[PDB]
UniProtKB/Swiss-Prot annotation:
It comes from Homo sapiens (Human). This is Agouti-signaling protein. The gene is ASIP. The keyword Protein biosynthesis does not apply. One of its GO terms (biological process) is melanosome organization. The presence of a 'disulfide through disulfide knot' structurally defines this protein as a knottin.
Amino acid sequence: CVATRNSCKPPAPACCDPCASCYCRFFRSACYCRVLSLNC
């Protein structure tokens, strides 16, 4: 589906997992697929 380097917005299409949302973790406001959680 998608890894964790694609920009998108919830809910759908989502990021494979329902815990994977399109968020930014950098100072570039680059919000992309990211769950930020192992137990999820």
